[PDB]
């Protein structure tokens, strides 16, 4: 026995969008078309002779399919941008004709035509009794031509010449390149297949048929690190979390769950308890060695700026910071927090060792306190390490078309540790003259826990600069070195857990997680340059089509959307209209440029050959003979807008100053209005003698509005009533105003057949690294860039 008391909670939908990481971005699903791109269609119209009488035969004419043209000369250009976005999504990547080829119902031998529509046309002409004989004989000898040795075919078609130039361009310009064994191995980058430790293997060889779609891997034409410090922060925090995923776990931490059971049942048998050979310290764990190995590699591969976090009262975290600044270049550590760590080593460890006065380092001095203590110190070995830290920089070299920042050559070797521990030994044999003896005993106990680890620290530098060197082959986008907004906290009490808890076991990144880090840096970089070129081709086609009214925030709003890592609603109009000034200056890619000219050359042939829109009416205020046509009979049409002053009705609605036309419409001057007017058909002849066509323009004077204009297009022919006025009386029909309208083209069948060609068979393959199955050499003997191995220390 219940009772429900429910109330109205107001609905609140905040502006948001879904954000995916780089690990799960779906690649672009490839488009292949099913039917041809048709915009013109043959239609059956009655025909009228020169007298006006209806003839016994009929005639075929090209008219549009779904002719929905909006009125007004600006809405037509807004339609043709919409048509240009319709051909691009229908444009296929690979087009085979064996998928779309239907049987001709009647031919000499039973061949195939290329579409279900162009078979419906060629059977409409055959059973039509009114057709000529030589048109019917042409459909009989209309079969395909197939050649097996080059695997191309030749299917016939019946296409409009505008429709043919859109389908012929889809066939010759396809994104399929051939594929075989010697081109799968070129997909793997050069620093992996020319590496000793990875051995690359594959089972199946691909045929002479199989093709693949190469991604446009050219570097970012937008300089999104230049002046875009809120978009480069989120495009590197999306790369730092991807790079953290592929950096491997240390072998001292990780093992399976059952091996703990496998090592517990024999631990009491084989007593190996101090094999690890380390002095313990409070605050040392292995979960921070595994953490600091990943936030040193993945903050280098994505170029985040780390921020050091430490306490001054820990004399071991400052000694382990000496190893950190001498391997990672100081351009990565942020200046407000590199300096407070670089000064804390000076005022605690270096300057009390020599008895010098601790330095007055004011805030914001342009010289960092290692660059000001290589001049003030008088030793040679600790002034040789302070010269390396002051000049440790990334070396921007371009390798395989991808600019990436390799480390210094001494850091990959390990020789920097032999420069530090040669300097960390002379600093331990000093006397510490000012400070008391227990302060000398507190450093000399802690600086010797790091000089005892020289064999394990000359090799961490080898391994840290080999995991960074190997994984850097898998990037594709151009890594630039620019200081980002938000920083990644690296705790300096977690470098101490790295420096003295590693040992004798190389962790080398397995090749199954190199091919995954490379197939998500291609699937994002190819999802970048296919959204630049999709959003440049609309910005340049907006300015070329003269759309002065379109606010182009919207076609940059979805460019940032399809890159799945940006949140749109927290990116304002400031960072979306600066981006329009960069996308405008770029050249549009060749497939979109060659197909916009195929709209722009004949955006006046699509517009003129359609009903329910007429391109302006002309007014004469004098009787003139209206010309005889065969599809209309007698029509007040004008094919050329010549001899008359023109008024642009796109501008007469824009500025709205009607003072020109309403002073030119009362005085009866001959005026040719120009625009896109919806016309009506008045087939009666006794409306023409009553001069109905002149009475429609007087609603521009009393009422300002010009969009409510309907010019009259007469049609006088035999099926029209009261036609005997033209027959008995010898008069040609005379109108006052005629419509500037174009005649539809005739459907000449033998001139509209086109022989479309394509290949017989492809097998388009999606990704290519499924075939090559790589494996790594045993990490006891794994080779660095030197041919000596890493983890060689006993």
């Amino acid at each position: 026995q219940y009772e429900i008391l429910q109330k109205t909670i107001p609905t609140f939908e905040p502006k948001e969008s879904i954000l995916k990481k780089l690990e799960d971005i779906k690649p672009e699903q490839v488009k292949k078309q099913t039917k041809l791109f048709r915009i013109f269609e043959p239609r059956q119209l009655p025909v009228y002779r020169a007298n006006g009488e209806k003839e016994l035969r009929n005639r075929w004419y090209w008219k549009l399919k779904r002719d929905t043209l909006p009125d007004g000369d600006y809405d037509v250009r807004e339609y043709f941008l919409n048509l240009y976005d319709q051909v691009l999504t229908e444009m296929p990547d690979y087009l085979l004709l064996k998928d779309m080829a239907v049987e001709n119902k009647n031919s000499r031998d039973a061949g195939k035509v290329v579409d279900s529509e162009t078979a419906a046309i060629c059977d409409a002409i055959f059973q039509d009794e009114e057709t000529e004989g030589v048109v019917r004989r042409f459909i009989a000898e209309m079969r395909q031509r197939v050649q097996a040795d080059r695997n191309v075919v030749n299917y016939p078609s019946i296409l409009h010449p505008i429709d043919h130039a859109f389908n012929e361009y889809f066939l010759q310009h396809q994104l399929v390149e051939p594929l075989n064994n010697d081109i799968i191995f070129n997909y793997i980058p050069e620093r992996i297949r020319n590496d000793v430790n990875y051995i690359l293997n594959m089972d199946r060889n691909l045929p002479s048929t199989a093709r693949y779609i190469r991604p446009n891997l050219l570097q970012d034409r937008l300089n999104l690190h230049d002046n875009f410090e809120s978009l480069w922060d989120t495009i590197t925090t999306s790369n730092y979390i991807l790079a953290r995923s592929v950096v491997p776990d240390l072998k001292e931490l990780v093992s399976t769950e059952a091996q703990i059971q496998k090592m517990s049942q024999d631990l009491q048998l084989e007593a190996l308890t101090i094999q690890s050979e380390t002095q313990f310290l409070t605050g040392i764990n292995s979960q921070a060695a595994n953490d600091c190995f990943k936030t040193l590699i993945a903050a280098m591969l994505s170029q985040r700026t780390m921020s050091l976090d430490f306490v001054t009262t820990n004399y071991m975290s400052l000694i382990s910071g000496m190893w950190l600044l001498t391997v990672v270049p100081n351009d990565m550590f942020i200046r407000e927090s590199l300096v407070a760590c670089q000064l804390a080593i000076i005022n605690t460890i270096i300057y009390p060792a020599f008895g010098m006065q601790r330095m007055h380092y004011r805030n914001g001095d342009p010289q960092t306190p290692f660059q000001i203590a290589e001049q003030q110190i008088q030793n040679f070995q600790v002034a040789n390490w302070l010269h390396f830290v002051n000049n440790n920089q990334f070396r921007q070299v371009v390798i395989d078309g991808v600019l990436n920042q390799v480390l210094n050559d001494n850091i990959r070797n390990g020789h920097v540790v032999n420069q530090l521990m040669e300097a960390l030994m002379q600093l331990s044999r000093q006397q510490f003259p000012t400070m008391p003896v227990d302060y000398k005993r507190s450093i000399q106990r802690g600086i010797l826990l790091l000089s005892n680890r020289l064999g394990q620290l000359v090799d961490l530098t080898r391994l840290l600069a080999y995991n960074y060197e190997t994984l850097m082959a898998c990037i594709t986008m151009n890594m630039q070195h620019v200081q980002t907004l938000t920083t990644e906290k690296l705790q300096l009490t977690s470098v101490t857990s790295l420096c003295m808890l590693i040992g004798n076991a190389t962790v080398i990144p397995s090749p199954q997680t190199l091919f995954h880090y490379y197939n998500v840096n291609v699937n994002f970089h190819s999802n970048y340059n296919e959204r630049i070129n999709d959003a440049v081709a609309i910005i340049t086609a907006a300015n070329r089509l003269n759309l002065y009214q379109k606010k182009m925030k919207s076609i940059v709003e979805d460019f940032l959307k399809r890159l799945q890592i940006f949140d749109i609603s927290r990116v304002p109009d400031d960072q979306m209209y600066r981006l329009r000034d960069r996308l405008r200056l770029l050249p549009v890619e060749i497939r979109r440029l060659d197909i916009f000219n195929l709209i722009l050359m004949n955006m006046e042939q699509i517009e003129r050959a359609s009903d329910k829109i007429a391109q302006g009416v002309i007014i004469a205020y004098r009787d003139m003979q209206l010309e005889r046509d065969e599809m209309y009979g007698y029509v007040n049409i004008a094919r050329n807008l010549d001899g008359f002053q023109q008024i642009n009705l796109e501008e007469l609605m824009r500025t709205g100053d009607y003072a020109q036309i309403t002073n030119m419409l009362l005085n009866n001057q001959p005026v040719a209005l120009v625009g896109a007017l919806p016309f009506i058909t008045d087939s009666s002849v006794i409306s023409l003698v009553a001069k109905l066509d002149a009475t429609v323009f007087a609603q521009i004077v009393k009422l300002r509005k010009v969009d409510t204009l309907k010019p009259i297009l007469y049609k006088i022919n035999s099926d029209s009533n009261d036609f005997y006025l033209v027959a008995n009386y010898d008069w040609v029909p005379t109108s006052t105003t005629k419509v500037y309208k174009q005649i539809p083209q005739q459907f000449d069948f033998r001139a509209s057949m086109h022989m479309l060609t394509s290949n017989l068979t492809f097998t388009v393959y999606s990704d290519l690294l499924a075939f090559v199955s790589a494996d790594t050499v045993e990490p006891i003997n794994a080779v660095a860039f030197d041919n000596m191995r890493i983890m060689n220390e006993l």
């Binding site: 691909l206 199989a210 199954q512 997680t513 388009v764 393959y765 999606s766 990704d767 499924a770 075939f771």
Partner: peptide
Amino acid sequence: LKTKEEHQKEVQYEILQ
């Protein structure tokens, strides 16, 4: 990772098959 790429093999080996 292992299951995702082992499914990526059998969709790419099957276009050949």
